[PDB]
Paper text:
The genomes of Bacteroidales contain genes encoding glycan-degrading apparatuses that typically co-localize in discrete clusters known as polysaccharide utilization loci (PULs). Altogether, our data suggest that human gut microbes employ evolutionary strategies to express distinct ENGases in order to optimally metabolize the same N-glycan substrate in the gastroinstestinal tract.
We observed no substantial conformational changes in the protein backbone for the unliganded and glycan-bound forms of BT1285 (r.m.s.d. of 0.4 Å for 271 residues). While both BT1285i and BT3987i inactive ENGases bind to the Man5 oligomannose on RNAseB, BT1285i exhibited a 1000-fold higher binding affinity than BT3987i (KDs of 3.5 nM versus 4.3 μM). Therefore, glycan accessibility clearly plays a role in these binding events, as the affinity of BT1285i for the exposed glycan on RNAseB was 12-fold higher than for the constrained glycans on IgG (KDs of 3.5 nM versus 42 nM). SDS-PAGE analysis of the SEC fractions indicated the formation of a 2:1 BT1285i:Fc-HM highly stable complex.
Numbering used by the authors: 44 to 79, 80A, 81 to 201, 202A, 203 to 225, 226A, 227 to 306
Write the structure that this text describes.
């Protein structure tokens, strides 16, 4: 049961567009990631910051999130560094529990299905924060798991993720971080059934022939997911139908609904 996991840049793209692709009377995509809320060091606090676009979607969850979940799509909050020098991987123990508390609170408050960690753009070490890893990234996954054990946690395989092997039982999926070409390996010791070794950039899209070939390999090699980054509001069905044929022996169709970002 390969899962299709798509990241949506909510600064540009209305997440409802993920619901416009259909394969076998179900949404093509199984997980939608609202990319992204940020971790921000503010003095000695580790903070969760939702920019106006993220916060608008969360404030309008009944119209911008719930319709996806009503279709059976799991909707996750993306988490990304934001240039303050503090990131997932250089926190002390107090900051780790602060950030875990903030994230779990966001998931419960907005009725989300989980979170995705993308350890990018933290600019580790700026503003007096540690320049290297403190080992906090593994403790953060454990803290968050303990606060919300039935919710999904995915990890984009970028940054300090190599440290996560000891905690990987708490991680549902890992996603390969480079686009349009598979790497037949996994990060942080994940089994193949919990990894996407192939991640399609839906903005700078590959050919449908490359998507069908590589997705068929994802399936025949027993991997459990395929990643998709930057679904836009155009009709990208030729690529997704390539995957449907390759990985799912099926087809994917587009319903024509291009949802605007008018907020």
């Amino acid at each position: 049961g390969i899962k299709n996991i798509v990241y949506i840049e909510v600064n540009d793209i209305n997440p409802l567009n993920a619901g416009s692709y259909i394969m076998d009377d179900a949404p093509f995509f199984d997980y939608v990631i609202l990319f992204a809320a940020n971790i921000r060091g503010v003095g000695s606090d580790a903070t969760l910051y939702n920019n106006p676009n993220v916060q608008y979607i969360l404030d309008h969850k009944d119209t911008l999130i719930k319709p996806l979940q009503d279709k059976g799509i799991k909707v996750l909050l993306g988490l990304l560094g934001d240039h303050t020098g503090l990131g997932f991987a250089n926190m002390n123990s107090a900051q780790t529990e602060q950030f875990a508390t903030a994230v779990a609170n966001a998931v419960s408050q907005y009725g989300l299905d989980g979170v995705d960690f993308a350890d990018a753009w933290a600019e580790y070490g700026r503003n007096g924060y540690p320049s290297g890893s403190t080992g906090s990234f593994s403790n953060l996954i454990t803290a968050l798991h303990n606060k919300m054990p039935g919710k999904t946690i995915t990890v984009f395989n970028y940054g300090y993720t190599s440290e996560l092997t000891g905690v990987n039982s708490y991680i549902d999926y890992g996603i390969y971080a480079f686009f349009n070409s598979p790497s037949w390996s996994t990060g942080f010791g994940m089994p193949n059934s919990k990894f996407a070794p192939y991640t399609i950039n839906l903005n700078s899209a590959p050919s449908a022939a490359s998507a069908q070939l590589y997705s068929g390999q994802v399936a025949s090699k027993g991997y459990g997911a395929i990643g998709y980054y930057d679904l836009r509001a155009n009709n990208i069905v030729s690529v997704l139908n390539g995957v449907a044929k390759g990985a799912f022996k099926s087809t994917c169709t587009y319903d024509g609904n291009s949802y605007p970002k008018n907020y």
